[PDB]
Amino acid sequence: SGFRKMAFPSGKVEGCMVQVTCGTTTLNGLWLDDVVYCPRHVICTSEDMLNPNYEDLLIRKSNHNFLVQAGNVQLRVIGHSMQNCVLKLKVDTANPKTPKYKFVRIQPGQTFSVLACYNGSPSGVYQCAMRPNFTIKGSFLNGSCGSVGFNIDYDCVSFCYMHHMELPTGVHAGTDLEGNFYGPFVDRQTAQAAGTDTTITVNVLAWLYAAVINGDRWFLNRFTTTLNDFNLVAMKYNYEPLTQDHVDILGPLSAQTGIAVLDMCASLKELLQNGMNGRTILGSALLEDEFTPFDVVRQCSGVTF
């Protein structure tokens, strides 16, 4: 029993974290095979960040301008290139701790574990979701750039996020490992704001199933709803639309608990219209949306890596 916000075991990623220094800036890099990936803004001064021409800033750098440290060992940089907003530093040594990995771009609503790092040293691991507005509600201080987000599927690490910046509201923005930003953000010190966010409906439903599995049923009711009537309610309360794909994805949890997806939607509609009435669900007075249906199944079944 119990239901916790759980991250993947971070060991496979810890063995890839390195420190990258370019001039006065130090941030984190991800060392996989003979390449170290890091945010391209590592080459910027504070003034350059106002309006950077990354090609112009990069052409002026030599390999020796990048200092890469893996633990207490210096990695020799033998090449450098840019891919979108990520800098790729070719090093003279393949990482012997390179796990089986892939680079995957995730969609809003998908969750992943973040290994927060400072000076190439992992400091913490936490689970988060890619918000519908393409930000993540992370926990990052100065020096955390280059920290990565990932999932594990069997023994393969799927890297999905690299940290680049914090927006004025305290939320975070970054890219996939191919350097493409999630959201309409740019790597520049300019006025940028996260758009109005919405709740990840399919994830709230998955967490309501987790609550039922854990013995919390007070919110269940005799009612059902149509997908169109539910979506009219979801739009009203800034919840993301629930698609037939989401309904299909929740099928296994619906079969396990005996609560149809549209039956659980009727519980959610009532919760949105009435509140919790002083009650909690899984120790929360808010509807949690950072557990996917796969996370709930994995946690309530015990999948290992």
Ligand X SMILES: O=C1C[C@H](NC(=O)[C@@H]2CCOc3ccc(Cl)cc32)CCN1
What are the residue numbers of the active site?
Answer: 41, 145
238: left (phi over 0), alpha (psi -120 to 50) or beta: left
227 and 242 Cβ atoms separated by less than 8 Å: yes
Q: Within 263-282, which residues bind a copy of itself (CB under 8 A)?
A: 280
Residues at the site binding ligand X, with contacts judged by CB under 6 A: 41, 44, 48-49, 52, 140-145, 164-166, 172, 187-189
**Backbone torsions φ then ψ of 231, nearest 5 degrees:** -65, -30
Residue listed under structure tokens 């239901």:
3
Cα distance between residue 192 and residue 31, in whole Å: 30
Please state at what angle helix 201-213 crosses helix 261-274, rounded to 10 degrees: 100
Nearest residue (CB) to ligand X, 187 versus 289: 187
Q: How far is the CB of 284 from a copy of itself (least distance, A)?
A: 7
Residue with smaller CB distance to a copy of itself, 164 or 246 = 164
Residue 135 CB contacts under 8 Å (≥ 6 apart), including other chains: 167, 171, 172, 173, 182, 183, 194, 197
User: Does residue number 297 form part of the binding site for Cl ion (CB under 5 A)?
Assistant: yes
* Pick from 275, 276, 272, 248: nearest CA to 261: 248
Q: Are 272 and 233 a contacting pair, CB within 8 Å? A: yes
- With CB under 5 to 8 Å by kind, the binding choice for 110 among ligand X, Cl ion, a copy of itself, none is Cl ion
Q: Which does 49 bind (CB under 5 to 8 A by kind): Cl ion, a copy of itself, ligand X, none?
A: ligand X
Q: Which of residues 236-255 bind Cl ion (CB under 5 A)?
A: 252
Q: Taking CB within 5 to 8 Å according to partner kind, which of a copy of itself, Cl ion, ligand X, none is near residue 297?
A: Cl ion
CB-CB contact of 251 with 244 (8 Å)? no
Of 83 and 127, the one with the shorter C-beta distance to a copy of itself is 127
Q: How far is the CB of 138 from ligand X (least distance, A)?
A: 7
Site of interaction with a copy of itself (CB under 8 A): 1-12, 14-15, 115-119, 121-128, 137-141, 143-144, 166, 170-172, 214-215, 280, 283-286, 298-305
Site of interaction with Cl ion (CB under 5 A): 106-107, 110, 252, 297
